Symmetry: C3
Subunit: 228 residues, 3 copies
């Protein structure tokens, strides 16, 4: 519970906060309208995660959920972070390839379902039911990945070269990191409990920084964000 | 409480889920940008309701509220469904007639107030106060219906013929179904308690499927969704 | 707690409600597309505050929070009001100067952080931690004010004259009123408790009406809202 994993929470808080400041400073030197959208979106991601990481570190974003026959510590603040940051990350990818509003809404909607059902599963009191919510959330995640490959990948190409390769790298990064979340949830304290909360927190922290800050570094360092 | 009405909840879950899949498959054959917006919006509606129906069926979206001198079972998950699905349905209507952003914001805002105040009323502990919230929510609903007739109906016409007639039918469907919700709430467990929760659940399920799936069928089967 | 301050809550409810109706009637005489956006945004602000003021008056938007060694009455409904009304007010300012989407997202995001962290601080059980959240929220507020002066003020000018002067006055009003909120929070029941809840409620009510209704009056009475 709220002790062993404090170091990963403090490290996560520090890393999000440092990334936010870096992106903020880096973005000061920005005039291009479109480059500005990418900077605004990308800087807000770590800023939000920073606040939620801090809430968990201080104990606010933690709650106890009874199931399986025990009082299980559940960090609900994560979902609070994910509800806003994941759609923003998807927005960066969509703006990059200039997706139509229809596909953007589909991605945002699928993302809301993924995080929402993930939260319902995290707070469910009937053990077996938790995995039903996990499956539904996972289906929503696969839909998103499908759109990113069969509804996006085919358009980045019909666009500028630099936009295509940058999108391809960010797309690959997203697919790899995002797919790991359901696995961590399944084996950790929220699911089967095969991995202790301490290790679970460490895993999400590494994933969260790589998806928030790592992702932002790649994106904000490319010329794909400027109007040619 | 959480037993007799299980069948309507299970039927509702199944019907939303089937509608979502149908719209998903049907939309695979879609290239037109605008047709895509209508499919994305319309498919997300049943998808959300599906998750909330399931949460109620499993018991997660149910809570007890003390008032009138009793512990009353209240399915709060409904509001959670309504908060997102009603504005999306209004968006379908607005896109159809190509409404201006000003009117869209007014509708979305009025809708948020309608659902929000409806939720406050559902969870209020002072019996008489529940109806004050019901009245305010009902006023917000009338505003929406007013805009749909005196701020929309007059524009669908100044547009394409097929757009006008389709909008007219969907407009009529909406007015009829939506107006029934406050009545059901008033006579059911949330309000006067003249109708038992069992029958109340049945009523909302029939209304919810007709407004979510029935509405989508009419819309997604018309040529009004394509750019001529 | 829920008694002495009832008059300020009732006065606040009445003033928001009257402002909403006034703006609604005033806006009936509106055809211009852009003028419509300003009316829709501006009328929704008092409408939302009206509902939240009423929830506090009736006792629904009030909760008890343990900290410092006492059971402290906290009106959480305020944040619920602020989460939606502050970004809408910022939207009025942004539309006025025709800000780019990038800056709009930055303002909305910073605003969400400001209100969200303010709420976490309001509900925090560890006294000293409450001020950590206050500081973070205050930093987010300063960012917003910075953008309004160094990212907005310089563009209203490169626009129409009437737009510039109206923006300047609304900008000034915002800076003055918004800066007062963190001070009231710090000295009131949410913070140091130097000022009683009764006086705290009075202060927020005066600020809330001036920022919601006062602000709307200035804006909706200017020619800057019309397309020349
Ligand atoms: C903050 C950044 C990212 C990329 C967060 C991503 C989170 C997910 C993709 C979470 C997915 C879940 C699934 C598919 C099912 C179990 C519950 C989760 C919400 C962890
Ligand atoms: C899911 C689809 C629809 C069309 C849901 C509609 C819901 C309403 C129009 C609810 C309205 C309410 C009112 C006017 C007052 C009592 C409380 C309600 C939230 C049920
Ligand atoms: C309803 C209208 C307005 C203008 C409300 C404004 C509210 C704020 C600017 C609140 C700011 C806060 C800060 C900076 C730190 C303490 C907590 C608050 C949420 C009160």
């Amino acid at each position: 519970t709220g002790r062993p994993e404090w170091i990963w929470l403090a490290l996560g808080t520090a890393l999000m906060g440092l990334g936010t400041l870096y992106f903020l400073v880096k973005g000061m030197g920005v005039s291009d309208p479109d480059a500005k959208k990418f900077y605004a979106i990308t800087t807000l991601v770590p800023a939000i995660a920073f606040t939620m990481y801090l809430s968990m570190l201080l104990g606010y974003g933690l709650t106890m959920v009874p199931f399986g026959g025990e009082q299980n510590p559940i960090y609900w603040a994560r979902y609070a972070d994910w509800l806003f940051t994941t759609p923003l990350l998807l927005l960066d990818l969509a703006l990059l390839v200039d997706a139509d509003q229809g596909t953007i809404l589909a991605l945002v909607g699928a993302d809301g379902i993924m995080i929402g059902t993930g939260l319902v599963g995290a707070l469910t009191k009937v053990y077996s039911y938790r995995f039903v919510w996990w499956a539904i959330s996972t289906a929503a995640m696969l839909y998103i990945l499908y759109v990113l490959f069969f509804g996006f990948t085919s358009k980045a190409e019909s666009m500028r070269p630099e936009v295509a390769s940058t999108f391809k790298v960010l797309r690959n990064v997203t697919v790899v990191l995002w797919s790991a979340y359901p696995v961590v949830w399944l084996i950790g304290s929220e699911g089967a409990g095969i991995v202790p909360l301490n290790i679970e927190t460490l895993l999400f922290m590494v994933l969260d920084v790589s998806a928030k800050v790592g992702f932002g570094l790649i994106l904000l360092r490319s010329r794909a964000i400027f109007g040619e």
